[PDB]
Amino acid sequence: TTAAPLLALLRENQDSVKTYALESINNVVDQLWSEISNELPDIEALYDDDTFSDREMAALIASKVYYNLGEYESAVKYALAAKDRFDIDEKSQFVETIVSKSIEMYVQEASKQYTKDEQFYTKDIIDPKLTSIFERMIEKCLKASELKLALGIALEGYRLDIIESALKSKLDQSTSENVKIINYLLTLAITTVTNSKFRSSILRKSFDFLMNMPNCDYLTLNKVVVNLNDAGLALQLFKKLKEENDEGLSAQIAFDLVSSASQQLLEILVTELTAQGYDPALLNILSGLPTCDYYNTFLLNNKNIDIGLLNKSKSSLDGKFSLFHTAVSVANGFMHAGTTDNSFIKANLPWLGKAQNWAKFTATASLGVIHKGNLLEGKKVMAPYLPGSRASSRFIKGGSLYGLGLIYAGFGRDTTDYLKNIIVENSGTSGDEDVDVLLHGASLGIGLAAMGSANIEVYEALKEVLYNDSATSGEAAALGMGLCMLGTGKPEAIHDMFTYSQETQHGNITRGLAVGLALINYGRQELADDLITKMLASDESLLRYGGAFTIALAYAGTGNNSAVKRLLHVAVSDSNDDVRRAAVIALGFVLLRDYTTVPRIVQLLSKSHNAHVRCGTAFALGIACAGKGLQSAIDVLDPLTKDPVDFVRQAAMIALSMILIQQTEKLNPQVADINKNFLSVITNKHQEGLAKFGACVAQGIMNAGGRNVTIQLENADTGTLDTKSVVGLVMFSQFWYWFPLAHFLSLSFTPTTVIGIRGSDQAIPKFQMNCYAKEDAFSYPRMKYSSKPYKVDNMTRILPQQSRYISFIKDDRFVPVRKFKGNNGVVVLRDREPKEPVALIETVRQMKD
Known part of the structure; x- marks a missing residue:
């Protein structure tokens, strides 16, 4: 009413x-x-x-x-x-x-x-x-x-x-x-x-x-x-x-x-x-x-190994070319990783000889991947190439210290002492090319050995190498400093590293320290947000490069929305092609835990006209979908293998091989065609140098550790993230800029x-x-x-x-x-x-x- x-x-x-x-x-x-x-x-x-x-x-x-x-x-x-x-x-x-x-x-x-x-x-x-x-x-x-x-x-x-x-x-x-x-x-x-x-x-x-x-x-x-x-x-x-x-x-x-x-x-x-x-x-x-x-x-x-695959790679890609040499040198180490068997290199000794300059560095340090683990006889194996071994070049001698850190990674307490002494002895000297290549290998290796140690004496030792401002040694020292301080968010370190990236006159070094800063913030999440803003805001593209990786790590495994958005923005709106590539790749880390969403979130980006963005999305998928066999990721990656741009075809294949590791024609019928294709690319003479190196390296990954390893970033039982494998993958992602860094993928290999x-x-x-x-x-x-x-x-x-x-x-x-x-x-x-x-x-x- x-x-x-x-x-x-x-x-x-x-x-x-x-x-x-x-x-x-x-x-x-x-x-x-x-x-x-x-x-x-x-x-x-x-x-x-x-x-x-x-x-x-x-x-x-x-x-x-x-x-x-x-x-x-x-x-x-x-x-x-x-x-x-x-x-x-x-x-x-x-x-x-x-x-x-x-x-x-x-x-x-x-x-x-x-x-x-x-x-x-x-x-x-x-x-x-x-x-x-x-x-x-x-x-x-x-x-x-x-x-x-x-x-x-x-x-x-x-x-x-x-x-x-x-x-x-x-x-x-x-x-x-x-x-x-x-x-x-x-x-x-x-x-x-x-x-x-x-x-x-x-x-x-x-x-x-x-x-x-x-x-x-x-x-x-x-x-x-x-x-x-x-x-x-x-x-x-x-x-x-x-x-x-x-x-x-x-x-x-x-x-x-x-x-x-x-x-x-x-x-x-x-x-x-x-x-x-x-x-x-x-x-x-x-x-x-x-x-x-x-x-x-x-x-x-x-x-279990199919040696013909390596053999076709050596016969098709001539080792006089530092690229093709690196391609096989690396694929070798992958298939043989942790396995201890050096059979392939023993068999083609002459092939090893054609490697020049840094391709020599890579081949030496590749023993380190084959010998990963093997703490007992590890140091012995490296003796012929060690410094003072009557070795021919600072490449062999320098890559030896790097092969050494590869072997002892995570056990390196003894090895760290050894390497730390070489650094302190030779940090004083300047203007010498032999000491520089040595100090490179020392720093990569010492980084693997001191990884996560938060050890101030190695950090300090390395810091001295960085100041020589040798373009040759500088990058290694910076990476070393990151690996050493990994996850500490140590404010002293961040400050020292950031200030110097501007003062230096070398780009690679500024790129080294950008990544180095990413490593130091690994896992820190929101406590990294202040440094992230400075870096993303910087006029220097290289620092914005580091900015993307700093999110990839700090927010790794979290599905964080702010961070996913902020990276989508950088990918779309940034001026620099490398920075746009880095921002897409970082998505793979941030989303590694929700990996099924990854193919839809990056599907559009894979269609972008910009090849650097297209290529960063092959890698985002590779990283996030690594252990998994995910079909939706393969569907996105399929087209990219047929891409017009060579280095997009390359990343697509490498990523497929990380997604498909250990899969077989019986499990996934498509894997036969994928494997066949890695081969056609290597055999064909008309196919680009970069597509091949990527196909060759893909075989090494597909078949890594004699078929007995997988890549998994998150531990199945604890749900915790495996630091060693993450870091493995983040360094591997730098290979475009430095090839030797490729071997770092070996940390991501885990035996099944x-x-x-x-x-x-x-x-x-x-x-x-x-x-x-x-x-x-x-x-x-x-x-x-x-x-x-x-x-x-x-x-x-x-x-x-x-x-x-x-x-x-x-x-x-x-x-x-x-x-x-x-x-x-x-x-x-x-x-x-x-x-x-x-x-x-x-x-x-x-x-x-």
């Missing part, structure tokens, strides 16, 4: 009468809101009246009317003023709307307030009314018991204390379920929280909850440690693992930490366990040696196998596991699920796609310490019948003694 009779009562003097009127109107407000709006000033007058008892009801009615009107900022103001009389349980559009809007406002408020104070929630800083709705919305979720929404909101609003309490009250004390929750809350914090100081706090709190649980999940506890990169947490991890003592577990855990975790953390953790007189068996695994040993043995024994280990003696038993799949499927090239499994031997090639199908045999002598994850690496076995004899696999190190 009409609300006028009710509205009239608002004028009555007694509160009991106005209150009755308000509550009556409330019932009909949804029909009569138009009629009622006319009286709003009266209704608000009631709210503004300090002595009216039911003002909260006045507000509530105002709110409902503004809402029904479509003035929302007003409806919120009043619902908030309503306080309690606003009922979040009521199921209605009104309530959904103002609750959504209130949450938005509180998060906005809380972001701003958190950066000023992380305890902000304990102060009155935020509006108590707004706070109330937020917290009550939380309460509602926990009463209905959806804790995954309750946690999300609390997360979104920077409230760690709510998350903490919520977990206490919601932990049963079915621990397996608890762990699932902490895992969801971790995944959320890593993949959404954009504030570091915050994201850290959650992991640190998630750690203490996992630590206190009676049943302990170390698999999850490992995730937290690697993510935070915190040696103190690792230490606690083991001290708790000691008091549980089950030796098999402690071993498995150490094998896990050795694969996923960072080098500098492993070093700090052994030194402390060592000094605390920890078990010598564990201290051995945590040195990395055993694992390096198992992978070495694996690559030596299972190596499941390796059983007997926990007690750390010995490798020969047994068989079940693989539910068709046998023909995962076989090497001639050169999915199956109900009936087939048997696969321990320590043999297991493709990443294939891991899901592998199963340990239920009744068998060997049973895994913890349940099988379903993916590659070392798995620690328990022996049911220790007395009985088993055939054992001899470690290469073992034969020596």
Whole structure:
């Protein structure tokens, strides 16, 4: 009917009468809101009246009317003023709307307030009314018991204390379920929280909850440690693992930490366990040696290689041309990587001889890739070419120090000392060409050996090389300084490096330091944003080049929108062709975790008229889609292999080979045509020099490590990013500017196998596991699920796609310490019948003694 009779009562003097009127109107407000709006000033007058008892009801009615009107900022103001009389349980559009809007406002408020104070929630800083709705919305979720929404909101609003309490009250004390929750809350914090100081706090709190649980999940506890990169947490991890003592577990855990975790953390953790007189068996695994040993043995024994491919490359591309020499020199090292077998070069010695200048540098250092790992005899192999070896040229002698760092990468503590001495000795000398080429090789190698070390004495040593401002040595020193300081965001270093990139008179050096600055910010995310802006703003294209890479690293693996947009802008709007290429490539890193979106995001760019942009998108795809076999990426790349521009055809093929590594005609029918094409390009005399070098190098990648490696930037188990492989790929992307840098791709090669280990003696038993799949499927090239499994031997090639199908045999002598994850690496076995004899696999190190 009409609300006028009710509205009239608002004028009555007694509160009991106005209150009755308000509550009556409330019932009909949804029909009569138009009629009622006319009286709003009266209704608000009631709210503004300090002595009216039911003002909260006045507000509530105002709110409902503004809402029904479509003035929302007003409806919120009043619902908030309503306080309690606003009922979040009521199921209605009104309530959904103002609750959504209130949450938005509180998060906005809380972001701003958190950066000023992380305890902000304990102060009155935020509006108590707004706070109330937020917290009550939380309460509602926990009463209905959806804790995954309750946690999300609390997360979104920077409230760690709510998350903490919520977990206490919601932990049963079915621990397996608890762990699932902490895992969801971790995944959320890593993949959404954009504030570091915050994201850290959650992991640190998630750690203490996992630590206190009676049943302990170390698999999850490992995730937290690697993510935070915190040696103190690792230490606690083991001290708790000691008091549980089950030796098999402690071993498995150490094998896990050795694969996923960072080098500098492993070093700090052994030194402390060592000094605390920890078990010598564990201290051995945590040195990395055993694992390096198992992978070495694996690559030596299972190596499958088609040598004709290299041979066609040598016969078609003449080694007198420094390009064609580099092309095969590199492809050699790739196929033979880590495998230790030098057969090809021994066979064509004369071919090696035609290499001149820097092509000589590359061929020497290629021994380093073939010998990657091989810590035992590694230094010996290089002796003939070492300095003072009676070597013929500073190319052989300089590339030797680079082949050396390649071998010992990640183990280089000994090698670092060796190389550091050469630098300090020869940094003083200037004007000598022989010392310059030497100081180049020293710096590339020392960078690989000191990588991630944050070691100030090597940084300082290298810094002296840079000041000689030799164009020859300068680039290496800068890269070295980046590799050395990688991920530190060390402000001293950034400052020193930036200032000098302007003062120097050499371009390559300014390009060296641009990348160097990218390395130092690797992983830093938002803390890199100030430096990124300076760099992108610079007039010097080379620094803008570094700007793109600094985003690629700092934001690597994050799907960050600001950063994806900022790079799309640089790609489209930048004046410089190299800078536009670098900005597209950086997309591959930023998006490596969401790699399926990558082909659509760059599809248009692949059609661009600018060839540098077209070429950068082959690489964005190569990088982001590396381990994966993704078809949508291949479809985008297919046309680019037929591109008019040579270096676009080149990047397209190289990228295809990284996307397709280990794939075979049986898995993907298209791979036959792709392989065939790599060949036609190499054979044809009319095909451009650059297309060929790219096809040749592509074969090396496709077939790398005797078919037993893959490229994966993100660790399958921890979800963490593999630093070594990222850096591998970011240097590889510099090859256009410096060819020797190509070998850096070797850091991205990881062996694909499941390796059983007997926990007690750390010995490798020969047994068989079940693989539910068709046998023909995962076989090497001639050169999915199956109900009936087939048997696969321990320590043999297991493709990443294939891991899901592998199963340990239920009744068998060997049973895994913890349940099988379903993916590659070392798995620690328990022996049911220790007395009985088993055939054992001899470690290469073992034969020596």
